[PDB]
């Protein structure tokens, strides 16, 4: 497979290799704030990242992933809409060429500069590969980024990007604390959806925080210096690596807050 974000291999083409691209629970979606309903039965969200063990950062030619040790329950997401325990495996971002675009989810059609995805898998399925074959296999925590003040907790990420410029490059990335990427409030919207990249599997409970984080123009500018291409190939800047909003179909977005 040779999918990407360009004219010739972008989201409009994905359905030919990945027919589930036109499925019934695809992501992302527009979150219409006047149609999402407060759900008083949602339990409180529990983000337990105190023992998180980051290992490595990888440019995979689509984004960069910060990878965690998920061999035990070190960093987990529980509560909210979730049953059981979901283990953090990696985070990555989607971003734009310009500050007015970049997020995958939109809020009343508003696009943010970027979107962070913290990816967790359901431990009742034993491993990540098994979990993605299940409708409740993954829980992705989605956080919007807007351009304003710098995010101190992001700077370690920004500063390693020079060392993973091109596809297939990785760097050691130990002792990074993903708690520094969270906003103050954990108010969220939730709905059932999919991976937003091939293979687009319909295995995700999406939990999208209402409060964006602010990052600086300098910080996001450094995301935009990454490359989709490998070393010694023609330079294609890693920008606009976001899939646009997909049909909501027969789904309801629930709000954790009134
Ligand atoms: O957070 C996102 O963008 C969704 C997302 C989360 C995890 C992810 O992992 C890669 C992958 C999953 C299944 C099969 C092959 C590759 C791919 C997409
Ligand atoms: Zn993502």
mmCIF file of C-alpha atoms and ligand atoms in Angstrom:
data_model
loop_
_atom_site.group_PDB
_atom_site.id
_atom_site.type_symbol
_atom_site.label_atom_id
_atom_site.label_comp_id
_atom_site.label_asym_id
_atom_site.label_seq_id
_atom_site.Cartn_x
_atom_site.Cartn_y
_atom_site.Cartn_z
ATOM 1 C CA UNK A 1 0.000 0.000 0.000
ATOM 2 C CA UNK A 2 1.091 3.540 -0.948
ATOM 3 C CA UNK A 3 -1.433 5.753 0.743
ATOM 4 C CA UNK A 4 -0.738 9.315 1.781
ATOM 5 C CA UNK A 5 -2.181 12.796 1.832
ATOM 6 C CA UNK A 6 -1.363 14.079 -1.700
ATOM 7 C CA UNK A 7 -3.676 14.538 -4.725
ATOM 8 C CA UNK A 8 -2.821 11.130 -6.088
ATOM 9 C CA UNK A 9 -2.868 9.027 -2.889
ATOM 10 C CA UNK A 10 -4.892 11.038 -0.413
ATOM 11 C CA UNK A 11 -8.118 10.440 1.502
ATOM 12 C CA UNK A 12 -10.262 10.450 -1.668
ATOM 13 C CA UNK A 13 -8.325 7.433 -2.991
ATOM 14 C CA UNK A 14 -8.175 5.303 0.162
ATOM 15 C CA UNK A 15 -11.426 3.508 -0.480
ATOM 16 C CA UNK A 16 -9.931 1.536 -3.403
ATOM 17 C CA UNK A 17 -7.529 -0.425 -1.200
ATOM 18 C CA UNK A 18 -9.558 0.038 2.029
ATOM 19 C CA UNK A 19 -13.296 -0.204 1.202
ATOM 20 C CA UNK A 20 -14.239 0.379 4.889
ATOM 21 C CA UNK A 21 -13.299 4.025 4.077
ATOM 22 C CA UNK A 22 -16.977 4.359 3.098
ATOM 23 C CA UNK A 23 -18.226 2.402 6.145
ATOM 24 C CA UNK A 24 -20.789 3.190 8.806
ATOM 25 C CA UNK A 25 -18.559 4.434 11.641
ATOM 26 C CA UNK A 26 -15.708 6.333 10.023
ATOM 27 C CA UNK A 27 -13.662 9.079 11.663
ATOM 28 C CA UNK A 28 -13.097 11.914 12.030
ATOM 29 C CA UNK A 29 -16.448 13.717 12.197
ATOM 30 C CA UNK A 30 -17.725 17.236 12.713
ATOM 31 C CA UNK A 31 -18.889 17.713 16.297
ATOM 32 C CA UNK A 32 -22.013 19.825 16.187
ATOM 33 C CA UNK A 33 -22.181 21.371 19.658
ATOM 34 C CA UNK A 34 -25.902 22.098 19.362
ATOM 35 C CA UNK A 35 -26.801 18.447 18.565
ATOM 36 C CA UNK A 36 -24.445 16.578 20.949
ATOM 37 C CA UNK A 37 -26.424 15.737 24.077
ATOM 38 C CA UNK A 38 -25.227 15.806 27.679
ATOM 39 C CA UNK A 39 -25.210 12.206 28.978
ATOM 40 C CA UNK A 40 -25.564 12.191 32.767
ATOM 41 C CA UNK A 41 -24.691 8.490 32.894
ATOM 42 C CA UNK A 42 -21.095 8.995 31.626
ATOM 43 C CA UNK A 43 -18.766 8.201 34.548
ATOM 44 C CA UNK A 44 -15.817 10.441 35.348
ATOM 45 C CA UNK A 45 -12.815 10.137 32.974
ATOM 46 C CA UNK A 46 -9.618 8.755 34.560
ATOM 47 C CA UNK A 47 -6.269 9.587 32.960
ATOM 48 C CA UNK A 48 -3.582 7.722 34.966
ATOM 49 C CA UNK A 49 -0.240 8.587 33.364
ATOM 50 C CA UNK A 50 1.953 8.781 36.534
ATOM 51 C CA UNK A 51 3.934 5.651 35.625
ATOM 52 C CA UNK A 52 4.087 6.254 31.864
ATOM 53 C CA UNK A 53 7.296 4.954 30.241
ATOM 54 C CA UNK A 54 8.068 6.609 26.906
ATOM 55 C CA UNK A 55 10.662 4.840 24.781
ATOM 56 C CA UNK A 56 11.144 6.216 21.336
ATOM 57 C CA UNK A 57 9.967 8.673 18.712
ATOM 58 C CA UNK A 58 9.517 7.531 15.097
ATOM 59 C CA UNK A 59 8.848 9.307 11.779
ATOM 60 C CA UNK A 60 6.668 6.727 9.974
ATOM 61 C CA UNK A 61 6.187 8.807 6.786
ATOM 62 C CA UNK A 62 2.648 9.853 7.822
ATOM 63 C CA UNK A 63 3.235 11.446 11.245
ATOM 64 C CA UNK A 64 5.614 10.927 14.163
ATOM 65 C CA UNK A 65 4.763 8.534 16.964
ATOM 66 C CA UNK A 66 5.964 8.782 20.529
ATOM 67 C CA UNK A 67 5.879 5.138 21.662
ATOM 68 C CA UNK A 68 5.370 3.856 25.205
ATOM 69 C CA UNK A 69 6.068 0.667 27.078
ATOM 70 C CA UNK A 70 2.684 -1.067 27.122
ATOM 71 C CA UNK A 71 3.922 -4.437 28.484
ATOM 72 C CA UNK A 72 2.086 -3.620 31.800
ATOM 73 C CA UNK A 73 -0.589 -1.168 33.103
ATOM 74 C CA UNK A 74 1.800 1.808 33.424
ATOM 75 C CA UNK A 75 -0.257 4.551 31.711
ATOM 76 C CA UNK A 76 -3.980 3.866 31.349
ATOM 77 C CA UNK A 77 -7.249 5.492 30.442
ATOM 78 C CA UNK A 78 -10.427 4.360 32.258
ATOM 79 C CA UNK A 79 -13.899 5.668 33.035
ATOM 80 C CA UNK A 80 -15.937 8.053 30.916
ATOM 81 C CA UNK A 81 -17.698 5.867 28.334
ATOM 82 C CA UNK A 82 -15.154 3.062 28.720
ATOM 83 C CA UNK A 83 -15.571 -0.373 30.255
ATOM 84 C CA UNK A 84 -12.334 -1.703 31.677
ATOM 85 C CA UNK A 85 -8.788 -0.590 31.229
ATOM 86 C CA UNK A 86 -7.102 0.865 28.175
ATOM 87 C CA UNK A 87 -3.318 0.963 27.941
ATOM 88 C CA UNK A 88 -1.423 3.879 26.334
ATOM 89 C CA UNK A 89 0.716 2.646 23.400
ATOM 90 C CA UNK A 90 1.568 5.813 21.487
ATOM 91 C CA UNK A 91 0.656 9.385 20.680
ATOM 92 C CA UNK A 92 0.978 11.394 17.476
ATOM 93 C CA UNK A 93 -0.432 14.518 15.883
ATOM 94 C CA UNK A 94 -2.140 15.702 12.714
ATOM 95 C CA UNK A 95 -1.426 19.225 11.526
ATOM 96 C CA UNK A 96 -1.749 21.774 8.781
ATOM 97 C CA UNK A 97 0.269 23.803 6.350
ATOM 98 C CA UNK A 98 -1.399 26.927 7.822
ATOM 99 C CA UNK A 99 -2.786 27.674 11.293
ATOM 100 C CA UNK A 100 -6.404 27.594 9.984
ATOM 101 C CA UNK A 101 -6.377 23.843 9.255
ATOM 102 C CA UNK A 102 -4.856 20.668 10.572
ATOM 103 C CA UNK A 103 -7.281 19.021 12.964
ATOM 104 C CA UNK A 104 -9.258 15.963 11.913
ATOM 105 C CA UNK A 105 -12.270 16.477 14.145
ATOM 106 C CA UNK A 106 -13.971 19.824 13.751
ATOM 107 C CA UNK A 107 -16.225 21.701 16.181
ATOM 108 C CA UNK A 108 -19.164 23.371 14.494
ATOM 109 C CA UNK A 109 -17.031 23.104 11.319
ATOM 110 C CA UNK A 110 -14.113 24.890 13.042
ATOM 111 C CA UNK A 111 -10.714 23.421 12.120
ATOM 112 C CA UNK A 112 -7.911 23.748 14.666
ATOM 113 C CA UNK A 113 -4.191 24.054 13.825
ATOM 114 C CA UNK A 114 -3.557 20.505 14.912
ATOM 115 C CA UNK A 115 -4.882 17.516 16.829
ATOM 116 C CA UNK A 116 -3.147 15.204 19.289
ATOM 117 C CA UNK A 117 -4.176 11.523 19.462
ATOM 118 C CA UNK A 118 -3.260 9.499 22.506
ATOM 119 C CA UNK A 119 -3.876 5.898 21.463
ATOM 120 C CA UNK A 120 -4.902 3.265 24.041
ATOM 121 C CA UNK A 121 -5.867 -0.424 23.658
ATOM 122 C CA UNK A 122 -8.317 -2.549 25.662
ATOM 123 C CA UNK A 123 -6.302 -4.884 27.885
ATOM 124 C CA UNK A 124 -9.077 -7.553 27.788
ATOM 125 C CA UNK A 125 -7.824 -8.354 24.267
ATOM 126 C CA UNK A 126 -4.253 -9.020 25.366
ATOM 127 C CA UNK A 127 -2.425 -7.124 22.613
ATOM 128 C CA UNK A 128 -2.851 -4.196 20.262
ATOM 129 C CA UNK A 129 -3.146 -6.360 17.123
ATOM 130 C CA UNK A 130 -6.058 -8.288 18.619
ATOM 131 C CA UNK A 131 -7.715 -5.173 20.036
ATOM 132 C CA UNK A 132 -7.961 -3.436 16.610
ATOM 133 C CA UNK A 133 -10.158 -6.349 15.381
ATOM 134 C CA UNK A 134 -12.777 -5.476 18.037
ATOM 135 C CA UNK A 135 -15.435 -2.746 18.030
ATOM 136 C CA UNK A 136 -14.331 -1.672 21.510
ATOM 137 C CA UNK A 137 -10.656 -2.369 21.003
ATOM 138 C CA UNK A 138 -9.178 1.146 21.164
ATOM 139 C CA UNK A 139 -9.807 4.380 23.045
ATOM 140 C CA UNK A 140 -8.276 7.464 21.433
ATOM 141 C CA UNK A 141 -8.064 10.667 23.459
ATOM 142 C CA UNK A 142 -8.185 13.586 21.034
ATOM 143 C CA UNK A 143 -6.874 17.045 21.995
ATOM 144 C CA UNK A 144 -7.124 20.143 19.824
ATOM 145 C CA UNK A 145 -4.175 22.486 19.411
ATOM 146 C CA UNK A 146 -4.563 26.209 18.743
ATOM 147 C CA UNK A 147 -1.751 28.666 18.092
ATOM 148 C CA UNK A 148 -1.136 31.138 20.921
ATOM 149 C CA UNK A 149 1.150 30.716 23.912
ATOM 150 C CA UNK A 150 3.787 27.998 23.911
ATOM 151 C CA UNK A 151 3.077 24.654 25.572
ATOM 152 C CA UNK A 152 6.096 23.985 27.858
ATOM 153 C CA UNK A 153 5.292 20.284 27.987
ATOM 154 C CA UNK A 154 5.510 19.984 24.190
ATOM 155 C CA UNK A 155 8.948 21.544 23.780
ATOM 156 C CA UNK A 156 10.896 18.290 24.346
ATOM 157 C CA UNK A 157 8.933 16.819 21.426
ATOM 158 C CA UNK A 158 9.593 19.872 19.217
ATOM 159 C CA UNK A 159 13.306 19.767 19.944
ATOM 160 C CA UNK A 160 13.883 16.136 18.909
ATOM 161 C CA UNK A 161 12.146 16.569 15.490
ATOM 162 C CA UNK A 162 15.401 17.646 13.822
ATOM 163 C CA UNK A 163 16.743 14.133 14.478
ATOM 164 C CA UNK A 164 13.815 12.303 12.812
ATOM 165 C CA UNK A 165 13.319 14.504 9.762
ATOM 166 C CA UNK A 166 12.601 11.724 7.290
ATOM 167 C CA UNK A 167 10.575 8.542 6.999
ATOM 168 C CA UNK A 168 11.978 5.610 8.968
ATOM 169 C CA UNK A 169 14.135 7.723 11.306
ATOM 170 C CA UNK A 170 13.752 7.181 15.040
ATOM 171 C CA UNK A 171 15.292 8.514 18.229
ATOM 172 C CA UNK A 172 15.419 7.451 21.878
ATOM 173 C CA UNK A 173 12.662 9.370 23.749
ATOM 174 C CA UNK A 174 12.691 8.284 27.329
ATOM 175 C CA UNK A 175 11.247 9.992 30.377
ATOM 176 C CA UNK A 176 8.699 12.115 28.486
ATOM 177 C CA UNK A 177 5.591 12.907 30.580
ATOM 178 C CA UNK A 178 2.410 12.958 28.508
ATOM 179 C CA UNK A 179 0.581 14.737 31.366
ATOM 180 C CA UNK A 180 2.210 17.964 30.099
ATOM 181 C CA UNK A 181 0.113 17.770 26.911
ATOM 182 C CA UNK A 182 -3.278 17.861 28.667
ATOM 183 C CA UNK A 183 -5.506 20.945 29.055
ATOM 184 C CA UNK A 184 -6.921 21.902 32.494
ATOM 185 C CA UNK A 185 -10.408 20.474 31.891
ATOM 186 C CA UNK A 186 -11.239 16.876 30.937
ATOM 187 C CA UNK A 187 -14.732 17.799 29.639
ATOM 188 C CA UNK A 188 -15.199 15.690 26.466
ATOM 189 C CA UNK A 189 -17.354 14.551 23.603
ATOM 190 C CA UNK A 190 -17.519 10.844 22.780
ATOM 191 C CA UNK A 191 -18.727 8.716 19.848
ATOM 192 C CA UNK A 192 -17.916 5.355 18.175
ATOM 193 C CA UNK A 193 -15.568 5.576 15.251
ATOM 194 C CA UNK A 194 -12.481 4.441 13.428
ATOM 195 C CA UNK A 195 -8.772 4.809 12.863
ATOM 196 C CA UNK A 196 -8.395 7.964 10.694
ATOM 197 C CA UNK A 197 -5.598 6.359 8.597
ATOM 198 C CA UNK A 198 -5.510 3.092 6.680
ATOM 199 C CA UNK A 199 -6.513 0.440 7.539
ATOM 200 C CA UNK A 200 -9.376 2.629 8.891
ATOM 201 C CA UNK A 201 -10.631 -0.064 11.226
ATOM 202 C CA UNK A 202 -13.874 0.590 13.060
ATOM 203 C CA UNK A 203 -12.460 -0.214 16.510
ATOM 204 C CA UNK A 204 -12.235 3.181 18.328
ATOM 205 C CA UNK A 205 -14.154 4.844 21.136
ATOM 206 C CA UNK A 206 -13.323 8.485 20.494
ATOM 207 C CA UNK A 207 -13.013 10.813 23.442
ATOM 208 C CA UNK A 208 -12.366 14.367 22.234
ATOM 209 C CA UNK A 209 -11.592 17.018 24.846
ATOM 210 C CA UNK A 210 -13.508 20.266 24.626
ATOM 211 C CA UNK A 211 -10.659 22.482 25.865
ATOM 212 C CA UNK A 212 -7.874 22.901 23.308
ATOM 213 C CA UNK A 213 -4.249 23.344 24.319
ATOM 214 C CA UNK A 214 -2.265 26.370 23.147
ATOM 215 C CA UNK A 215 1.067 25.900 21.385
ATOM 216 C CA UNK A 216 3.239 28.602 19.844
ATOM 217 C CA UNK A 217 3.607 29.420 16.181
ATOM 218 C CA UNK A 218 7.292 28.500 16.579
ATOM 219 C CA UNK A 219 6.334 25.066 17.964
ATOM 220 C CA UNK A 220 3.905 24.223 15.116
ATOM 221 C CA UNK A 221 6.342 25.658 12.530
ATOM 222 C CA UNK A 222 8.832 22.988 13.607
ATOM 223 C CA UNK A 223 6.206 20.219 13.013
ATOM 224 C CA UNK A 224 5.947 21.559 9.470
ATOM 225 C CA UNK A 225 9.692 21.035 8.799
ATOM 226 C CA UNK A 226 9.334 17.259 8.949
ATOM 227 C CA UNK A 227 9.353 15.206 5.792
ATOM 228 C CA UNK A 228 6.947 12.562 4.461
ATOM 229 C CA UNK A 229 9.785 11.256 2.251
ATOM 230 C CA UNK A 230 12.798 9.141 3.216
ATOM 231 C CA UNK A 231 16.393 10.367 3.406
ATOM 232 C CA UNK A 232 17.844 11.243 0.001
ATOM 233 C CA UNK A 233 14.424 11.426 -1.697
ATOM 234 C CA UNK A 234 12.823 14.608 -3.029
ATOM 235 C CA UNK A 235 11.574 16.769 -0.131
ATOM 236 C CA UNK A 236 7.839 16.642 0.570
ATOM 237 C CA UNK A 237 7.030 18.628 3.687
ATOM 238 C CA UNK A 238 4.992 16.720 6.298
ATOM 239 C CA UNK A 239 1.990 19.034 6.352
ATOM 240 C CA UNK A 240 -1.758 18.543 6.006
ATOM 241 C CA UNK A 241 -1.624 14.955 7.264
ATOM 242 C CA UNK A 242 -5.286 15.065 8.319
ATOM 243 C CA UNK A 243 -8.367 13.265 7.012
ATOM 244 C CA UNK A 244 -11.442 15.456 6.650
ATOM 245 C CA UNK A 245 -14.750 14.973 8.403
ATOM 246 C CA UNK A 246 -16.685 11.794 7.403
ATOM 247 C CA UNK A 247 -20.450 11.168 7.406
ATOM 248 C CA UNK A 248 -21.892 10.772 10.914
ATOM 249 C CA UNK A 249 -24.521 8.305 9.663
ATOM 250 C CA UNK A 250 -26.367 6.516 12.487
ATOM 251 C CA UNK A 251 -24.280 7.833 15.416
ATOM 252 C CA UNK A 252 -24.806 10.202 18.336
ATOM 253 C CA UNK A 253 -22.067 12.285 19.867
ATOM 254 C CA UNK A 254 -22.498 12.500 23.657
ATOM 255 C CA UNK A 255 -21.181 15.335 25.858
ATOM 256 C CA UNK A 256 -19.756 14.802 29.353
ATOM 257 C CA UNK A 257 -20.723 18.315 30.357
ATOM 258 C CA UNK A 258 -23.870 20.470 30.391
HETATM 259 O O1 LIG B 1 -5.264 8.110 16.249
HETATM 260 C C1 LIG B 1 -5.378 7.904 15.018
HETATM 261 O O2 LIG B 1 -5.045 8.615 13.993
HETATM 262 C C2 LIG B 1 -6.030 6.583 14.791
HETATM 263 C C3 LIG B 1 -4.985 5.485 14.770
HETATM 264 C C4 LIG B 1 -4.510 4.867 15.910
HETATM 265 C C5 LIG B 1 -3.569 3.855 15.806
HETATM 266 C C6 LIG B 1 -3.098 3.431 14.584
HETATM 267 O O3 LIG B 1 -2.169 2.399 14.625
HETATM 268 C C7 LIG B 1 -1.627 1.916 13.378
HETATM 269 C C8 LIG B 1 -2.237 0.650 12.857
HETATM 270 C C9 LIG B 1 -3.335 0.037 13.419
HETATM 271 C C10 LIG B 1 -3.844 -1.135 12.897
HETATM 272 C C11 LIG B 1 -3.250 -1.717 11.803
HETATM 273 C C12 LIG B 1 -2.150 -1.114 11.229
HETATM 274 C C13 LIG B 1 -1.652 0.057 11.756
HETATM 275 C C14 LIG B 1 -3.568 4.046 13.442
HETATM 276 C C15 LIG B 1 -4.496 5.060 13.556
HETATM 277 ZN ZN1 LIG B 2 -4.338 10.165 14.661
#
